[PDB]
Each structure stands twice: as structure tokens, then as C-alpha cells.
Design a protein around this ligand. Structure first.
Ligand SMILES: Cc1cc(Nc2cc(N3CCN(C)CC3)nc(Sc3ccc(NC(=O)C4CC4)cc3)n2)[nH]n1
Length: 257
């Protein structure tokens, strides 16, 4: 049962990226509302990411979780590749941060729990994620967080969300994901990521040194969690279990494990 472009009514543009456009779309026969990402073969090849996309699509299709954006299917015609994706109505966590400036501790701990649950599920499937950016986190109709990128591995670019071992030219494993949780926890609470700078060169130095401070309003429990996640040595970061069992998380999160 192969899909073609004619099987979908195309709606308004959802996002405009470097590689292609994402549209709201509705499959004609079922009236199923979904997102359609359109990519040009010529452009993926010229950047040498066609294969990379194929591997990430294949990994994605194996993933089934309420907090991971679902890939339903794919197809392609003469010049274009089409990804058929779950439509998340409430948009990105990035836009929500822009509207709200920063999040309270309850929203933040809920998002972290949801992230850690999705990542726990991924780890048990030997799936590692690369850096997790807010722009790549979507919100479902009940405001549930959805990991929406395709940055998965089975064992550049802005630096803000990358761990030291990835920038220094070192060996990286599942502990990258816990650094990611650290950066996001901080950004949710503060309104910018902990190593933000005006230049790449300086962001590099800040991440490599783990050079960041907290504003005064950050509570002791949040401080404790972020500091444990942001360890330079990957093997010193806690496990996802320990994140989900952290007192600051358990005291503030609206959602369980
Ligand atoms: C793919 C997708 C996108 C959506 N939903 C939305 C919804 C949205 N909104 C824009 C702002 N209004 C106020 C709310 C809805 N804005 C974007 S902007 C956007 C577009 C694409 C991606 N991500 C991807 O395409 C992933 C596959 C790599 C992230 C954000 N995406 N559901 N599914």
C-alpha cells in the first residue's frame, strides 16, 4: 500500500527549514490529519545526508512512544522525498519559551520526566539520541512533549546542546542524553541554555570547561539535578532511573514514569 502526493490534501506551511518544508496535510480517503515533510533529492545528495536520512527514518519507524513524534510512513517521486508524520498541534517548546520567557518548576519537571521516559524507552532499544534542542520538541493536543528530530544512533551546527565529548573529538555513548537533559532543564528554568554565547568559539570553550552559573531564583533541588547532569566525564552522569527518582523531579512533576 504505497502513498503518492495525490493521496493528500495539502494545508498551510507549518515550518520552513534548510532542507525542506513541512505542511499540515490530510489523507483524502481517511481524512487523517498529519504532517508532511517534503525534501528534494538533489539537495540531500549535494549535502551528502541522503543516507543519513535513510538510517534515521529506518530507526524512527521502530520507535513507538507517547513522547516520541511518530513517523507513519514515507514515499518519493522523481525529485522529492516525503515523510508522513504525526501532527503535534500546540507547536514547539522553543516557541513556548519565547512566549513565556521561562518555565516554572512544575512545567519543567514534567517535561524532564517525559523526556527521561522517552529516552529510557530508547535506551532499552539500544537507541541513543544526539543533542536535543527545544526547536525539535513538539507539543501534542494535551500539551504532552514529543521528541521530533531524527537524531538517533545505534552505536556543525550550533554548539549549545552538544556535550564536551562530542565537541572535543572523543568517544560518546548513551550519557550524551543525560547531558541533554541537564542543558534543557537549565534552559526551561532560566530562559537560555547554560553555555550561550555570541560566538561559536566561546560557546566551545564554555562547554569544554563546563563553565556556567545559576541565577539566584534557581532552587537548591534544580541546582543539584542540573549539576549532576552536566558532568564533564560521561561516566559520572547518573542513569535515567536516578533522574526519574530525583526528589526535585518527584516533588514537582505532574506526570509519572
Ligand atoms: C512535523 C510536525 C510539525 C507539527 N506541528 C507543528 C505545529 C506548529 N505550530 C506553529 C505555531 N502555532 C501557534 C501552533 C502550531 N509549528 C510547527 S513548526 C515545526 C515543523 C517541523 C518540525 N520538525 C520536523 O519536521 C522534524 C522531522 C524533523 C518542528 C517544528 N509544527 N507536527 N508535526
Amino acid at each position: 500500500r504505497q502513498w503518492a502526493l495525490e493521496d493528500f490534501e495539502i494545508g498551510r506551511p507549518l515550518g520552513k527549514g534548510k532542507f525542506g518544508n513541512v505542511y499540515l496535510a490530510r489523507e483524502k480517503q481517511s481524512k487523517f490529519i498529519l504532517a508532511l515533510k517534503v525534501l528534494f533529492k538533489a539537495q540531500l545528495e549535494k549535502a551528502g545526508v541522503e543516507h543519513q536520512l535513510r538510517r534515521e527514518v529506518e530507526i524512527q519507524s521502530h520507535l513507538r512512544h507517547p513522547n516520541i513524534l511518530r513517523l507513519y510512513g514515507y514515499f518519493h517521486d522523481a525529485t522529492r522525498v516525503y515523510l508522513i508524520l504525526e501532527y503535534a498541534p500546540l507547536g514547539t517548546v522553543y516557541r513556548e519559551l519565547q512566549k513565556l520567557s521561562k518555565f516554572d518548576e512544575q512545567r519543567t519537571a514534567t517535561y524532564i520526566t517525559e523526556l527521561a521516559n522517552a529516552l529510557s524507552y530508547c535506551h532499552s532499544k539500544r537507541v541513543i539520541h544526539r543533542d536535543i534542542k527545544p526547536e525539535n520538541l513538539l507539543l501534542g493536543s494535551a500539551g504532552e512533549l514529543k521528541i521530533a528530530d531524527f537524531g538517533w544512533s545505534v552505536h556543525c551546527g550550533t554548539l549549545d546542546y552538544l556535550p564536551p565529548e562530542m565537541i572535543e573529538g572523543r568517544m560518546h555513548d548513551e550519557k550524551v542524553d543525560l547531558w541533554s537533559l541537564g542543558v534543557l532543564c537549565y534552559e526551561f528554568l532560566v530562559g537560555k541554555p547554560p553555555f550561550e554565547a555570541n560566538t561559536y568559539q566561546e560557546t566551545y570553550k564554555r562547554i569544554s570547561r563546563v563553565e556556567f552559573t545559576f541565577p539566584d531564583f534557581v532552587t537548591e533541588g534544580a541546582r543539584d539535578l542540573i549539576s549532576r547532569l552536566l558532568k564533564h566525564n560521561p561516566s559520572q552522569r547518573p542513569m535515567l532511573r536516578e533522574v526519574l527518582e530525583h526528589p526535585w523531579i518527584t516533588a514537582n512533576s505532574s506526570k509519572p514514569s
